[model samples]
Target: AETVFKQNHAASGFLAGRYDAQAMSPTMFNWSRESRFTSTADGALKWEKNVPATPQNGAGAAVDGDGTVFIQSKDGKLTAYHPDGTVKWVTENLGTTYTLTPVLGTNGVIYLPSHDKKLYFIDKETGNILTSVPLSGAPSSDAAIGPDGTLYVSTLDNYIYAIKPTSPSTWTQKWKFKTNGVVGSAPVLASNGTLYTATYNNIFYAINSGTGQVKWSKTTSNGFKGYPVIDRDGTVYAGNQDGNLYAYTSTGAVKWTFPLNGFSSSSLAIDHNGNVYIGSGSGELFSISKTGNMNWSFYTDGPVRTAPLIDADGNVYFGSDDKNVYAVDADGNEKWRYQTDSNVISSPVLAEDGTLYVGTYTKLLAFGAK
Candidate 1:
C-alpha cells in the first residue's frame, strides 16, 4: 500500500521542518519503488561536490523549483548554484550572519534574513534584490509565509513581525507581537492559522495569525533555542535547554514530556506513523513515538544540532558537528555517512532529483548517486 501523506503541509524550508505544510516531498525518494528504497543501510556513498559558499554556524541550504540551490556565506553573500554544481549567481553586501535557511516564498521570491536587522527579497532567477525591509531586531531564523500570504519573521528584538504584501512589490508591517524575551527561532504555522514560536527567555507562544495576538503561552525555567513542529493532531513539539521535549496541545496544555540526556536546539520532524525525530547536543539522534516513548537512538561523534529530514521510505537525513552528514533508516540504523571539510551544523535539504544539499562552516556539499 502506498503511504498517504498531507498534500498541503504549511511549513516550508529545511529549517521550517519539511518542504511543505503537509510535510510531503515525493520527488525526494523512490516513492514507487518503496521496497527498493526500504533502507539506506547498504546505500553506498556515491559522490561529493563542493561549492565556495562558506556558511556560518546556523546556515542551511535552500532548494528552489528550478533545482537552484541557494546558500548564504558568513562573509555576507548569497550564492545560487545550478543543478550541475555550477555557480548561477551571487548577491553580495546583503548583510551577513545568515543563521537560518533562506525561504522560498509562494510567489517565487527568495526571502533571506540576516543579523543586520534586515530581511531581503531576492529574485530567484536573476539573483537581484527586489527589496529589503528594515526590522527592529536581527533575525536569527527563517521567515515563514502564511497561508494567506503574510510573512512572519521572528527576531532578536523580542518580537514577531507580521508583514503583508500591500502591493505586488511592496510589503507593509501588518502587526508586531511583543514577547518577554528575544525570539531567535523560526515561526511555524498550524493548520488553524495559528503561529507558533519560541523565545530565548524560555517562552513558547501560540499566536493568532490574523491579529498577531497571543492565543496561548507556556514558559519554563530553561529557555527554548529551537522552533516547534505541529503534528496532525495539533500537538506542538518543542525542545528546550532543560534537556526535555514537550508535547503541548493547541491550547498550551502540556500533554507529555520526555527527558533527554542532552539539550536539543534542533526543530522536530514527525512521520506519518506519529513518530517524532530530533537530535541533541549530547551527540544523539532520537526517534520518539507520538505518545512520548523512545523508539530508538543513533549516536554520533559530535552533536546533532539540526532538524532531521525524512524521505518517503523513512530514511532520515541530518548533519552533525562531527563534520559528517548521515543517512539513517527508520530503525535508527546507519545507511551511509559523508564527511565534509568542517562541522555540519546546518540541516540537509533534498532536491527534486534525490540530491541532498548541506552547508558546512566553509563549504556547501551535494551528495547523491555517482
Candidate 2:
C-alpha cells in the first residue's frame, strides 16, 4: 500500500520551526501550486489572488495560530495579517533589522531576533512585548529550536548562544561559544551533540554543543554563504562561495570536494539514496555522489541560492533568479518550471500533507498535491 503524507508547512531561510506562511489562510495572493489552479479565490488573476504582495525588508516571515502571518516591513513595522489577506495588527520600530524568520511558541508567543543585538519574546494574542534578552551582536541568520524548547542562535560577533525558558516570562542564557569569524550561518546540531557551522573566514567548524569548544575546523578557498546539512549517516555537507561542495565526516576529516565553474552557495540536499543536490551561481543544478563525484547536472539561466526541496515522488524543487520555480527529476532533468516575479531565495518546505510550499520575491506559495 502507498502511504500518503498531507503537507502543511512554512519557513524562512536557515530557520526550521516557522511554517505558518504556507498553511492556514495564506495571503500575499502570490502564485503557488497550493493555491486554486484556475484563477484565484478573488476574480483578479494578476491583482487579487489569495495572497497579497505585503511589504517586507531583509527579514523573513513567521505564521502564528489563527492563520496569522507576521512580517517586518522596510519601514520597520512588525505586521500580522489574517489568512484572508487582511491586516490584523501592526507594531512599529523594533529598532533593528531582522535577517531571518521568527519562531512561534505553541501558546502563541513569537520569538524574534533583532539587529539591536537582542532576542525578544512577544505575546501574539495581546500584541504586548513580553521579554527581551540582549545579545553580543546582531543575528544575520535564523536559529533552531530544540525539542526541549532550547533556542539556539548565532551572531556576527562570532558566538553561538543557547537560550532556554527557565520559568514564566523568564529565560536564561545557558551557554555561549565564540567562533573565529562571524557566525552568520545557523547551527546544525547532530543527535550526538556535535554542532556544525561555517564562518565568514572560509572555514567550517564542528564544536561540542554541550561544551562550546571546537572539535575541528575544515577550510576551503571560499567563505561559506549558506548553512550546513547533516546527512542521515552524519556526513556534514556544506558549500563555499568559491564553487566547491565538500562532504566531511562529523569529526572534521575531508570526505570529498566537488568543484564547479561558478559560485557555490546553495546548501546541500541529500535524498534517500545518498545523492547530494545543490545549485551554482551559473544556474546549473548538480547531483553528486557521496564521494563528491558528479552524478548529473541541469543548466539554467540564473543561479539558485535557495536550497532544493525533494518531494516524495523523487522530484526536486527550487527557485532561480530567472524568476521561475523549477521542479527537477531525480536525474537532474527539468520536470516543470513556474515563472514568478523577482528572484527566489527562500527555501521550499514540504508539508506533511504533500503540499509543495516555496517562497518568491514577495510572497509564499503552495502547490497542490496533484
Candidate 3:
C-alpha cells in the first residue's frame, strides 16, 4: 500500500501536495489522537517549526520521496529542507522569478520551470543545475512526467513542449503544440498518452502525447487559471475564471459542469471515493460527488486560492488568504485552524510522517502534532 501510494503521487507530478497521486484521504495518524491532537483547546495541532522561506511570489512547496522539502522564492532561490526543518541545500538565481514548485523525476533529478523562459533540471542531492532547456516563453506551470519518462510542460508562449532526455546531462525537444493562448497551468498526462491542458484564451485541448497532434479542443466561457486533474477513469477536472468547475472525458467531451459563486484558481483534488474537492475565490470549498452533485460546502474567512491536500485519514488541508491554514474532516467540519502571520496563498503539502508544509507571504511553516 505504501509503494502504491508513492507511485500514485509520483504519477500525478507530485503537485497534489500529498504522497498519493490519487490525493485520497489517508487513514494513518502521525499525530497523537489520544492526547496531543484532539482539540484546539489543548493546542495539539499547533505549528512545530517554521523557517524563513521569503518567497517573492505565491509558489508552493514540494516534498521528495526522501522526505526533503523543496521551496522556491521569487528572488530565484530554491531551498531544500530536511524533515527536521533544517536547511539541507540551496540553489540560487536559476529563474528571474519562481512561481511553481519543483517536480521530482524518477531518476532523482528535479524539474523546475521558471518565468525566466527555461526549464531547469537540477540534482536533488547536491542542489546543482544539471541542464537548462530554453523555452519559447516563460513557463507559468509545473511540468508533468509521463509513464514513459517523457516531460510535458506548458509555456506562456502559447505552446506545450514535449521533451525527451537524450542523456543524463542533455535533453532534446520531442515536439511542441501551439494553443489558442498562453498556458499558465500544468498539463495532465493520461495513461493512454493524451495530455490535457487549459489556456488563458478560454480553450481546453487534448493533445496526442507522441505525435503532437490535436485530438480536440473545447471552448470555455472564461480562461483557466488553475491546473487540470485526471481521475483513474480518464476524466479531466478543471476550474475556470468564470466560476465553473468542469469535467471532461478523454475524448474532449463534457461530462458535467458545476457553478460556483466566485472565480476559481484552485486546483482540484479527488479522493478514493470519487469525491471532488475545490476552492473558490469567494472563500468557499466545495465537495462534489462523482456524478456532479453537490456533496457539501465549507466556508472560510477569505479566498482559498490554494489547492488542497488530503491525508491518509481523509482529512482535507489547505491555506487561505485569511492568514490561516485549515484542517477539516471529509464531512466538511473543521478539525483545527492554525493562524499564520500573513496570507497563505501557497498550498499545503504533507510528508509521509504527517508533517505539513506551507508558505506564507514571507515564510514557510511546518506543522504537526505537538
Candidate 4:
C-alpha cells in the first residue's frame, strides 16, 4: 500500500548531523527555511556550475534523498540536478515562481509554491508534474511536510491548509487553520505535532496540526515575515520585522529577544547544542547562546541575505551580497571563503556525502570538500 520513508525531519524532527547511515535520512535535509540545515564535511572548493537565475530571482534550493537538487534556474524554470553536478531533469518554463525554494517530499515528490497561486506536486526523478492544487491566494512558500506526510501550507488569504498525502498522484486537503492578516512565512512543524506560523499582523501562532486549532498566539513587536526554526527541546525562534530575533517557549511564552542590528534578512540556523546562528542586515553573522546572549559575531563585506547552513562539526556556511560564501567555525572564526561571480543570495543544501550546493545570481555552485 503506502510504504515509503519520508525525509521530513527538517520540518519536524531533530535527527541532524551528517545524516548518519540511514538511506531515507535525506542527502538534502529539508531542514526548515534556514534551520535543521547542516553539513559537516569540509575542505577546499571543487567546482561550480551555471544556473538560469540567482536564487533571489525565484525559487531557492532543495535536495532529496536520492541526491537530487530542485532549483529555479535556466531562465527561472524549475531545474533539477544530480550529485555529480550534472543536469538530472528540467521542467518547462513555468513562467514565474516565488522566491521560496521547492519542498522535497518522500515517495519521489517535490512540492512547489508558485506566485501563480498554485501548489504543484512534481516528480523528483522525472521533473514531471504529477498534480497541483489551487490555492485561494499565493502561498508564502511550498507546503512543509510533517512526519506523517501532511503538507502544511499558508496562503495570502490568511489560511493554513493541511493536505494529506495518500500517494504522489493523490493529495487531499485535510484541515485548515485560519488567521488574521496575510501569510508571511512557511509553516514550521515541530516534533510534538505543533505547527508554528506567523502573520503580517504581528501575531505568531502555535497550532495543533491534527485539529487545525490555534493553541497559543502572541503578538510581536513587528511581525514574523521569515521562517521560524525550532530548538531540539521544542523552543521556537523567529525573526520579526521589528528587527528582533525572538525565541519563544513551547507554551507561547517569550523566552528572549535578541537585537538584529536593523533587521535579519536571512532565516536562522540552530546547531545541535541549542546555539542559534543568525544573519543580520548589518552585514554580520552572530552566534547566539542558548541561554540568550551573543556568543560572537563574524563580519562579512556585505549583508548576508542568504540563510546559514551548519555541518555536524559545528561549522557554519552562508552567502553574502559581497559576492562570497563563507564558512566559520562554531566559535565564529573564519575557516574559509569562496568568491562567486555574483552575489550569493541562495541558501545551500548539502548532499549526503557532503557535496555543498549554493547559487549565485547566475549559477548554481557545487563544491566537494577537497
Output the number of the lDDT-best candidate: 4
Could you tell me which 10 consecutive residues in candidate 3 have the lowest summed lDDT? 27-36
Off by over 4 Å in 3: 1-59
Q: Give one digit per residue, the lDDT tens place, for model 1 in 118-202.
A: 8887777788988888999887567666655677777777788888765436888889988888774457777666788777787
- In model 4, what are the clashing residue pairs, if there are any? 10-31, 38-310, 39-310, 39-311, 51-363, 52-74, 60-101
The models' CA-based lDDT, in order, is: 0.67, 0.59, 0.68, 0.69
Those runs of model 1 whose alpha carbons end farther than 4 Å from true positions after fitting are 1-59
Misplaced by over 4 Å in model 4 are 1-45, 54-59, 74-76, 95-99
User: Distance from true position, residue 42, model 3, in Å?
Assistant: 9.3
Per-candidate TM equals: 0.86, 0.77, 0.86, 0.86
lDDT of 4 at 131: 83
Give the CA lDDT, 0 to 100, for residue 243 in model 2: 74
Runs in model 2 deviating more than 4 A are: 1-70, 79-84, 95-98, 105-108, 124-128, 350-357, 364-370
Question: What lDDT tens digits, residue by residue, belong to model 2 across residues 1-370?
Answer: 0221111112111222322332331221111112111111111112111222222211245544354556554345566655454678877667433334555553556677777677777776655678888988886555455545566778778888888765437898778877778654457666556777777776687777666788888777667655565565567676677777777776677888888568784655665566777788988878877667889887778988667766545677777778777877667777677777767665654434344445654666555455
Candidate with more favorable, higher lDDT: 1 or 2: 1
Per-residue alpha-carbon lDDT of model 3 for 1-370, expressed as tens digits? Answer: 1332342332232222122232211211110111111211211443433433333223467676566778777777888877777789989887754467676664657778777888888887889999989998887567666555667777777888888866447988889888788774467666566777777787788888888998888898787766666665677777888888888877778899988789885777776667777888889988888789998888988888667766656778777888888888879999788887887777776665566767776777777644
Clashes of 3: 9
